[PDB]
Amino acid sequence: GAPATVAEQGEDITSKKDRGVLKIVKRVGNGEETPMIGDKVYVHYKGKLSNGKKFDSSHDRNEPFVFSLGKGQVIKAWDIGVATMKKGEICHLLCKPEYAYGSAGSLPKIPSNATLFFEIELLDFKGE
């Protein structure tokens, strides 16, 4: 499945190269511009435990998820991963617990020490 494919083939985009955040681009985005730290980023996402269990999707509500890039409003894996995306890009990310919810987890959806999979679409980003 997609999570295994990221574990096997994904690019390690962490600075530490600890395989904490692994990435596969699934659809190429527009041009060369990526969001800057502080930009408001607008994403659609489908989130799964690494075992394939769906835990969330912005599409069910048809409400893009919006956050300020690099501000720690989201799990580290997203601050890292989204910063590498172009507008219109879809990627797959596989995220070790150290870059997600750690040993604490986020019950009831996310157990302790969970690796998370996301398919993320960067819909847009704004200066503000």
From Swiss-Prot:
Induction section of the entry: By androgen.
Post-translational modifications reported in the UniProt record: Acetylation impairs ability to promote interaction between Akt/AKT1 and PHLPP1. Deacetylation by SIRT7 promotes interaction between Akt/AKT1 and PHLPP1, leading to suppress Akt/AKT1 activation. Ubiquitinated, leading to degradation in a proteasome-dependent manner. Deubiquitinated by USP49, leading to stabilization.
Tissue distribution: Widely expressed, enriched in testis compared to other tissues.
Outcome of mutating residue 16 to Q: Mimics acetylation; impaired interaction with AKT1 and PHLPP1
Modified residues (N6-acetyllysine): 16
Signal sequence bounds: none
Location of the PPIase FKBP-type domain: 30-118
Subcellular location: Cytoplasm; Nucleus
Mutagenesis or variant effect for residue 16 to R: Decreased acetylation; promotes interaction with AKT1 and PHLPP1
Subunit annotation: Part of a heteromultimeric cytoplasmic complex with HSP90AA1, HSPA1A/HSPA1B and steroid receptors. Upon ligand binding dissociates from the complex and FKBP4 takes its place. Interacts with functionally mature heterooligomeric progesterone receptor complexes along with HSP90 and TEBP. Interacts with NR3C1. Interacts with Akt/AKT1 and PHLPP1; enhancing dephosphorylation and subsequent activation of Akt/AKT1. Interacts with IFI44L; this interaction modulates the kinase activity of IKBKB and IKBKE. Interacts with IKBKB and IKBKE.
Function: Immunophilin protein with PPIase and co-chaperone activities. Component of unligated steroid receptors heterocomplexes through interaction with heat-shock protein 90 (HSP90). Plays a role in the intracellular trafficking of heterooligomeric forms of steroid hormone receptors maintaining the complex into the cytoplasm when unliganded. Acts as a regulator of Akt/AKT1 activity by promoting the interaction between Akt/AKT1 and PHLPP1, thereby enhancing dephosphorylation and subsequent activation of Akt/AKT1.
UniProt-recorded name of the protein: Peptidyl-prolyl cis-trans isomerase FKBP5
Gene name for this UniProt entry: FKBP5
